Design a protein around this nucleic acid. Structure first.
Lengths: 79, 98, 127, 206, 61, 151
RNA sequence: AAGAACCUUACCUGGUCUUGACAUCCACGGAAGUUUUCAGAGAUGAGAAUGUGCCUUCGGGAACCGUGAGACAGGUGCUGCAUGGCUGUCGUCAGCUCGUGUUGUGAAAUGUUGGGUUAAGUCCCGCAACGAGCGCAACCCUUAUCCUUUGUUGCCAGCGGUCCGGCCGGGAACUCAAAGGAGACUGCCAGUGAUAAACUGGAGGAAGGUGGGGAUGACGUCAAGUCAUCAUGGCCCUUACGACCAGGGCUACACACGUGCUACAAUGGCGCAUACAAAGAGAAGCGACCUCGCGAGAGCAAGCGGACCUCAUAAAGUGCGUCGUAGUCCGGAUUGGAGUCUGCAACUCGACUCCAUGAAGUCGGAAUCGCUAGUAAUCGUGGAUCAGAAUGCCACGGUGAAUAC
């Protein structure tokens, strides 16, 4: 898609991810960052991605390699 | 050859420095080209007057940048130093390259 | 010998020279006709070689820069009428009646703050 | 006000700039930074002396500050001493060699910034302004001003409503383009707040 | 991209030219700033008309 | 206007063709400063007019214009009661102006091809005196004298 | 507001601190500082390293850091109807006023009404008013024309020499440039006009009746706008309305309106060839050239702090050819897929490329806006703002009118 030759991911979250990868899934992790672009290693693991007032529960699945954390999170309430 | 390109706010001021380089040069030695004029740079600004709102009227400003170029084709090397240095160049900026 | 005439219109510098002869029209060392002179100032610049005399009595050398079509023409036009003087400038007196001894002074008016162009004013809600 | 500033319009005409050093784009901001800094300290120290106008000018790639004034006496004191004492701390502020020359102007009541501080000081005394300001204006005409005008602006007399009050005496020919106009705003600070003091003095036509 | 080197984003993010604003040097205003004096327009005008800024004048082109 | 007089410059005569009248016609016709596309249109229209009619060059558009020149125009005016339309006798200059003026709007309104052709066709049904320009002319004569004496 | 991805940004939900983010001031201990780490979203707290310096008077002291103390700091908090300062606006509209004098019981009037005249309280004459000052006018900048001074990085006629390219001698003529100057003053004449003022017409002249533009804004009006540019009287909070930090919001969306851009086409689209600009900007910049890539762009990389070099190869226009009245070889919305560029960061929330998709629209109601000549109109270019940000604003030129009884 876009953003040139390879995306960015968050360092502090990556060390928590290696616990989630090695030990397997446990619970939604409460993360302030939305910034990371998902790649295969985050798949099958419960995380939670901030919307500016709460971490939104994303369980990661197969095609999410195409996506960032942030995309599933709603920052503007509606009727 | 050796040349002075000058820069000035006042046209009648860079005029006196390029007068002084001429009469210094033909005094101390010879061979000066006087002031080649060269086109004027004009820094034209416009800025908004009001502290708040009122876009409509603004005030325009200008800084006229007068250049001059003087060359000496002078080969009298040991009177070139006497031409050099001693001048204060009418209180405005000058640069002297070979 | 040579008869010189300068002229300007709209910041276009021209340099006209004239001597006797069955002249073709020479502009920047090419013909004006090979500069599309069917269209480019087509009879416009050959104004002194219209009213007071015919074309084929003077050789002519012209060098022009700046403007577009009408921009290029008037500098050459006012240089060529002034250069028309093989035996004196007596024909300027007849060209005075025509008006081609006087170049058109006019230039573009600047942009100023609060106008869309130069006299064009914006529209504004109610009144 | 809605008039153009007399000082600014006449800069290329008949009023020298109050800094006159040349600079290139790289150091133009930094020279103007030290120039705007020095004038704060310079206005602060020389209150008794009272500044007429200042030339901040270019010597040998350093700085020089010719200060004109009503009163040299407090500035000079003994020899070159109390001028040098200022010039030393200016050299620290500028960061380069600083050179100071103090320049007296005789009949100082005739010049505009100088009279304005005198008027504004009697506002600090809290005088009856209606007589006091006009008595100051009359002094200039008495001392051979061609024209003079004053305007004050604010809660004058401590007033609940804001008010204004000019006076003018002599020929001050404002929209005349050749005219030499010396003009200055100054303000007073009172227990009722700030009072503006504007003064126009007219010398000549060429 | 490459190895550990792209992961070196432990910087303060105060490094970036995306970060510093260029506020008015005298007043802190973050609007109306021309770079040439490095001030917002009103203190430029306040100085210029009072004749302090060297070589600067009105324009009538 | 009310006070000071206006009397503009008399424009360039058209090159070779020699009609300063047709030079004024292209200046009226001119779209958006394109005097170049205007002069491109006019000769193509003038050749196609003279080719169709079988006539000579200068008098072809001139005879077509001549039928469509009325001697009067009307003005909206009021003094007493609610607005009146008042006929007035045209200036001879403004006469030739009004004939040319209605032509360009008429040529835009046609069912025809591109501009050289459609303008020549408009000149054709003014030369034949049966199209839109004669219909615009043949109005004011009926309207006059129901309303004669107001200023 | 001449630039909301974080920062900006003030506000919210969250995480924190409280003599603090910043001043002024003391004591006490520590060079400042350059390295690295764990835990945390980060701020951060909590570390191990190391370094341990100019003056010294051997109690030091200046540069500077950390800790603690109390005087205090702080506020884009509140009050523009407490204010300065500053600005809009009626309006560059031609008016507006004070000295004395006279006139009236007096408020006041006259001056500043008249008779003419103009762009004009412009000017004459007349006058119970004479004078003054602010004002328009005019001094200025820029532009229309000429002459002198000056000739490189600019320019090239006459000259030679030319890879015959202003390229290289050279000429500096001439262009341009920028320094200095001239000329136009109702002055020249005629006529008309109260003879005066003035006016009309013509002359001569490159420029004629304020030459054009710009700058230049009277006394005063709206207790106008601005306590968020700043200053500031007064009021208030001062372990919170302050300060620091992360993410979010400022870009939402059944709607209404303003101000702009782009269309609805054939004077035009689309394809090829062909050609004149004017003003800019540039060193954490602009970046040729050369090569590479579908292109956006990428790699290598001269020259120049600029009449030189760079962005930078101005477009409409013009010559040929195609399309032929159609929701089109018109038009681009929307949306898909695949890409490039900046930055710690493209996620809410960037620009841009490529391929694909091809809504609406076939010229807009009542109503309403602008403009009197290089203007309207129309096509390009440039700058400020700036990491990246434009259909805005600000600037420049090309083409270039119609109509004013």
């Amino acid at each position: 898609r876009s953003l040139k030759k390879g995306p960015f991911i968050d360092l502090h979250l990556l060390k928590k991810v290696e616990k989630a990868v090695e030990s397997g899934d446990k619970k939604p992790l409460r993360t302030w960052s939305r910034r990371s672009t998902i790649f295969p290693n985050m798949i099958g693991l419960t995380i939670a991605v901030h919307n500016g007032r709460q971490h939104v529960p994303v369980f990661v699945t197969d095609e999410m390699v195409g996506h960032k954390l942030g995309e599933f999170a709603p920052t503007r309430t509606y009727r | 050859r050796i040349r002075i390109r000058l820069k000035a706010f006042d046209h009648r001021l860079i005029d006196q420095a390029t007068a002084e380089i001429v009469e210094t040069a033909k005094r101390t030695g010879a061979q000066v080209r006087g002031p080649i004029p060269l086109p004027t740079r004009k820094e034209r600004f416009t800025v908004l007057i009001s502290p708040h709102v009122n876009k409509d009227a603004r005030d325009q400003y200008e800084i006229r940048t007068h250049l001059r170029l003087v060359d000496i084709v002078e080969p009298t090397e040991k009177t070139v130093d006497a031409l050099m240095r001693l001048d204060l160049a009418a209180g405005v900026d000058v640069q002297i390259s070979l | 010998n040579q008869y010189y005439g300068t002229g300007r219109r709209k910041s276009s510098a021209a340099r006209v020279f004239i001597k006797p002869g069955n002249g073709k029209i020479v502009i920047n060392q090419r013909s004006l006709e090979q500069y599309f002179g069917r269209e480019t100032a087509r009879m416009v610049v050959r104004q002194p070689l219209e009213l007071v005399d015919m074309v084929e009595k003077l050789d002519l050398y012209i060098t022009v820069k700046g403007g577009g079509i009408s921009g290029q023409a008037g500098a050459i036009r006012h240089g060529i009428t002034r250069a028309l003087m093989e035996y004196d400038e007596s024909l300027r007196s007849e060209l005075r009646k025509a008006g081609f001894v006087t170049r058109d002074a006019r230039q573009v008016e600047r942009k100023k703050v609060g106008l869309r162009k130069a006299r064009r004013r914006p529209q504004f809600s109610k009144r | 006000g809605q008039k153009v500033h007399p000082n600014g319009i006449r800069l290329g005409i008949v009023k020298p700039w109050n800094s006159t050093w040349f600079a290139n784009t790289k150091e133009f901001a930094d020279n103007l930074d030290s120039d705007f800094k020095v004038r704060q300290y310079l206005t602060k120290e020389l209150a008794k002396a009272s500044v007429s106008r200042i030339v901040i000018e270019r010597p040998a790639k350093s700085i020089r500050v010719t200060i004109h004034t009503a009163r040299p006496g407090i500035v000079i004191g003994k020899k070159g001493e109390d001028v040098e004492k200022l010039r030393k701390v200016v050299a620290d502020i500028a960061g380069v060699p600083a050179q100071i020359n103090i320049a007296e102007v005789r009949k100082p009541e005739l010049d505009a910034k100088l009279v304005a501080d005198s008027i504004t000081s009697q506002l600090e005394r809290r005088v009856m302004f209606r007589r006091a300001m006009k008595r100051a204006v009359q002094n200039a005409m008495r001392l051979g001003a061609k024209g003079i005008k004053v305007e004050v602006s604010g809660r004058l007399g401590g007033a609940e409503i804001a008010r204004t009050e000019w006076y003018r005496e002599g020929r001050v020919p404002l929209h005349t383009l050749r005219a030499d106009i010396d003009y200055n705003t100054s303000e007073a600070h009172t227990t009722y707040g700030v009072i503006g003091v504007k003064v126009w003095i007219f010398k000549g036509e060429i | 991209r490459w190895n550990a080197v792209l992961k070196l984003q432990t910087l303060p993010r105060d490094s970036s030219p995306s970060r510093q604003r260029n506020r008015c040097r005298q007043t802190g205003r973050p609007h109306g700033f021309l770079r040439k004096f490095g001030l917002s327009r009103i203190k430029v005008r306040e100085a210029a008309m009072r004749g302090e800024i060297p070589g600067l004048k009105k324009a009538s082109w | 206007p009310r006070r000071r007089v206006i009397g503009q410059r008399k424009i360039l005569p058209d090159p070779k063709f020699g009609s300063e009248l047709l030079a004024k016609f292209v200046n009226i016709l001119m779209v958006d400063g394109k005097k170049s596309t205007a002069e491109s249109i006019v000769y193509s229209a003038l050749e196609t007019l003279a080719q169709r009619s079988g006539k000579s060059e200068l008098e072809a558009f001139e005879v077509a214009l001549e039928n469509v020149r009325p001697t009067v125009e009307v003005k909206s005016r009021r003094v007493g009661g609610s607005t009146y339309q008042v006929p007035v006798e045209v200036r001879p200059v403004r006469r030739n102006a009004l004939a040319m003026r209605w032509i360009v709007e008429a040529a835009r309104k046609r069912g025809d091809k591109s501009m050289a052709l459609r303008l020549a066709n408009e000149l054709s049904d003014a030369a034949e005196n049966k199209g839109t320009a004669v219909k615009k002319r043949e109005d004011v004569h009926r309207m006059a004298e129901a309303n004669k004496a107001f200023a």
